[PDB]
């Protein structure tokens, strides 16, 4: 220990800690707190300048009442009592914040699945007296698989309970139950009463303040797909087109909303999917000034020029070389002649003749720029310059996560100094209607059912479809029975599933791998673990989580749990060879020692000859081969086993028969339907037998 | 805490072996990558990739027949919820 310490330049012994105990005990605790801070690195892709309204979506059982709850929150943030709230509504709550409420329907899983893909923040109210109904539990399960939003539960009906002691016990139970579903340490606010038609100001003020500092995290799906919520719905058709064609037309439709997530590209012709209608495409993109402008934002606009009464927006409810390049009339011959004043199939570009080049390249003095006391100083400087060129990349944080995070942060403001130079005209096209730009994008070929049966109470979103997602191939996913759901899932039995922006029923098939040598189909689902599966439908990215359900018609629910199948997707192709095992049974009719004659497995003596040399096995576990087609009866054959087969014994020849995937596809089209609950698709195998009275 | 890089031993035939249980996780605080048992093979259904796992010390007392020495670690929680809570169907995996 004497010379080991002295090896370093500084005295090793001189630097020491007064307490070993405190240094050591504190060191472990501090490190655990840090490791906890570290999380895998992500990308935001939401603008620093103009953020969209963070969508907050009240959900829950219907008899509790969420309409009166949202009216007691907008009347304490804008001091303007509302009435008969329907559809999405935007209110400015702060100097830079402005949330957008969205009353879900409680009755419709078709909209309950729809909303959780877009709700940035979800407010869940569970009746204090009735605890958690199925609709709350069903919504929480679907939200978690797609991507967990920030949840802030609340507990109405707290006032009713007769005894405070019983009420305190009930509050602890719900609080503890809520912790398991969400994250422990999260407490749902409790509202005592609605005597005046609104909650107490003190309880509401705490709830409004708690929501304001939410600071929601970035979901993976939302930073890959440009999405928006439709503020107001507008049909733009001539009534003369309607009166002539007689209500059969597909209507030209303008829709209005705030963009989100990623920049929706402004060249018209990107395809984009209404949740619950079908795959559409954009036709015209226009941006108009947002109705609700933050006061800090308004001040900047006023200063450049040199709205207090309306603090909310509820429309549904009642009150150069480059510009020489991108023209197509110019020829590229003319383009360079406009710039000064050939096929790409050959690889070597057009040079001049060696006569013209050798006379030009006698001297290399034009290109010598690109190669590598006062006088002495100069020399030194030169050397330094060369040293930097010779060893610059090799020569040029404490935690790896912080560094690799700098790969994102430096990547952010190198967009921003790039976009800033463009900004008035070039940036908008390059910007492509960035998130929160209140855009007017119009459609075409929207069906007649959508405008007729419409009510503003249900939402409608858009999913900017990636070119990956636009096709239709059979996908390899894996999934399990959702362990709340009682019955197990069946192969080739239709299942409504929400994959990507789309909701649809398809015919899955549940395919294990017999120790990774093939894809054998099962007939059912392994009732407690993930099985590898397959189904036709739209295509997506791999590592996309979906969450499939059974009967989504609210006419037929019962008290069972609705969500039945959850899982991710592994890979996608257009053909999976998929194998059902079949075995050919046979019986011996004359045995010997070590050689059998087996009957009625093969029909003809020619059928045996297609199969000779096949490794036959028995029930008893002995092996063998089948060798020659016996002639004088048409069916039988001689087969040599390894030991004396019995008469009581049943030979089985393993074999594999390929199957197919049935290519049924059915988007749910929920709000094209009139009643908009009780959309009934393909029935289950058990249900059809009862209807047709088969056994 | 660590990030699931990939799942070792998926191609093992013999179920609930020792080669099968291994996942290869890189630690977040160092970037060192390391292998860890995930107990009772049916658990492997819960971990996928990039799934924020807590590693612990495995620390067996006496060697088994087929164990792999050098598997230092065991996986306890994944996405914040316990594997033994998952395996007993108490909680569900958040995403």
């Amino acid at each position: 220990a004497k010379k080991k310490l002295h090896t370093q330049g500084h005295n090793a012994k001189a630097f020491a800690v007064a307490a070993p105990g405190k240094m050591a005990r504190t060191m472990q605790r501090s490190s655990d707190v840090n490791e906890r801070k570290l999380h895998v690195p992500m990308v935001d892709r939401t603008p620093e300048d103009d953020p969209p309204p963070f969508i907050v979506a009240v959900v829950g059982p219907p008899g509790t009442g969420k309409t009166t709850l949202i009216r007691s929150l907008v009347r304490r943030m804008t001091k303007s009592t509302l009435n008969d709230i329907q559809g999405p509504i935007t209110v400015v709550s702060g100097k830079h914040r402005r949330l957008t409420f969205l009353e879900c329907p409680a009755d419709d899983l078709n909209a309950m699945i729809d909303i959780a893909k877009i709700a940035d923040l979800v407010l869940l109210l569970i009746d204090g007296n009735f605890g958690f109904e199925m609709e709350t539990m069903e919504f929480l399960n679907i939200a978690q698989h797609h991507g967990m939003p920030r949840v802030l539960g609340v507990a109405t009906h707290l006032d009713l309970f007769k005894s405070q002691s019983t009420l305190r016990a009930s509050k602890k139970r719900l609080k503890h139950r809520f912790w398991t579903e969400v994250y422990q340490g999260a407490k749902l606010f409790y509202l005592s009463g609605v005597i005046n038609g609104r909650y107490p100001d003190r309880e509401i003020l705490n709830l409004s303040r708690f929501i304001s500092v939410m600071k929601f995290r970035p979901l993976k799906w939302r930073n890959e797909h440009p999405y928006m919520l439709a503020d107001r719905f507008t049909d733009l058709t001539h009534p003369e087109l309607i009166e002539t064609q007689g209500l059969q037309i597909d209507r030209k439709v303008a829709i209005y909303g705030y963009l989100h997530g990623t920049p929706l590209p402004s060249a018209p012709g990107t395809r984009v999917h209404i949740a619950g209608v079908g795959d559409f495409s954009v036709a015209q993109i226009e941006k108009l000034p947002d109705p609700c402008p933050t006061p800090f934002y308004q001040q900047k606009l006023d200063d450049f020029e040199r709205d207090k009464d309306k603090l909310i927006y509820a429309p549904m409810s009642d009150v150069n070389i480059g510009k020489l390049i991108y023209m197509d009339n110019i020829s590229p011959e003319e383009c360079i002649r406009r710039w000064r004043g050939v096929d790409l199939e050959k690889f070597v570009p057009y040079f001049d003749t060696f006569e013209k080049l050798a006379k030009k390249w006698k001297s290399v003095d034009a290109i010598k720029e690109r190669f590598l006391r006062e006088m002495n100083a100069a020399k030194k400087e030169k050397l330094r310059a060369q040293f930097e060129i010779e060893e610059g990349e090799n020569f040029k944080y404490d935690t790896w996560y912080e560094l690799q995070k700098a790969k994102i942060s430096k990547q952010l403001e190198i967009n921003n100094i790039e976009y800033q130079e463009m900004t008035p005209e070039q940036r908008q096209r390059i910007e492509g209607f960035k998130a929160g730009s209140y855009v007017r994008i119009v459609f075409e070929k929207v069906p007649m059912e959508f405008v007729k049966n419409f009510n503003p109470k249900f939402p409608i979103v858009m999913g900017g479809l990636l070119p990956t997602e636009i096709k239709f191939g059979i996908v390899k996913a894996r999934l399990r029975r959702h362990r709340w759901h009682k019955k197990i899932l069946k192969t080739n039995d239709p299942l409504v599933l929400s994959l990507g922006w789309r909701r649809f029923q398809t015919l899955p098939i549940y395919t294990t791998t017999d120790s990774r040598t093939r894809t054998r189909m099962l007939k059912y689902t392994p009732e407690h673990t993930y099985c590898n599966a397959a189904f036709y439908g739209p295509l997506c990215s791999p590592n996309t989580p979906f969450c499939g359900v059974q009967i989504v018609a609210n006419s037929d629910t019962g008290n069972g749990f609705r969500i039945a199948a959850t899982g991710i997707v592994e890979e996608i192709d257009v053909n999976i060879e998929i194998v059902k095992k079949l075995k050919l049974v046979g019986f011996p009719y004359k045995i010997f020692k070590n050689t059998a004659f087996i009957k009625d497995m093969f029909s003809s003596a020619m059928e045996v000859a297609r199969f000779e040399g096949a490794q036959i096995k028995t029930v008893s576990g002995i092996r063998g081969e089948i060798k020659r087609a016996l002639s004088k009866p048409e069916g039988h054959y001689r087969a040599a086993f390894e030991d004396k087969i019995l008469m009581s014994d049943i030979v089985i020849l393993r074999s594999w028969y390929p199957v197919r995937v049935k290519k049924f596809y059915n988007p749910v089209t929920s709000l094209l339907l009139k009643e908009k609950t009780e959309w009934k698709g393909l029935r289950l195998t058990g249900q059809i037998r009862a209807a047709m009275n088969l056994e | 805490k660590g990030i699931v890089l990939e799942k070792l031993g998926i191609e093992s035939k013999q179920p609930n072996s020792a080669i099968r249980k291994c996942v290869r996780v890189q630690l977040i605080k160092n970037g060192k990558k390391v292998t860890a048992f995930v107990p009772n093979d049916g658990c492997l259904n819960f971990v996928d990739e990039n799934d924020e796992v807590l590693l612990a010390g495995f620390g067996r007392k006496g060697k088994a027949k087929g164990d792999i020495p050098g598997v230092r670690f065991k996986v306890v929680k994944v996405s914040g919820v316990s594997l033994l809570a998952l395996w007993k169907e108490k909680k569900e995996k958040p995403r």
């Binding site: 040598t517 040399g613 096949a614 | 070792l8 031993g9 191609e11 093992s12 080669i19």
Partner: peptide, 27 residues
């Protein structure tokens, strides 16, 4: 003909198997 396929692939799916196993054990 199916004998010469069923044998040859099964030999490949074992000769590729021990390589993929022994590449695990040494690492």
């Amino acid at each position: 003909f199916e004998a010469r396929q069923r044998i040859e692939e099964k030999n490949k799916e074992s000769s590729d198997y021990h390589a993929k196993m022994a590449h695990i054990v040494n690492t």
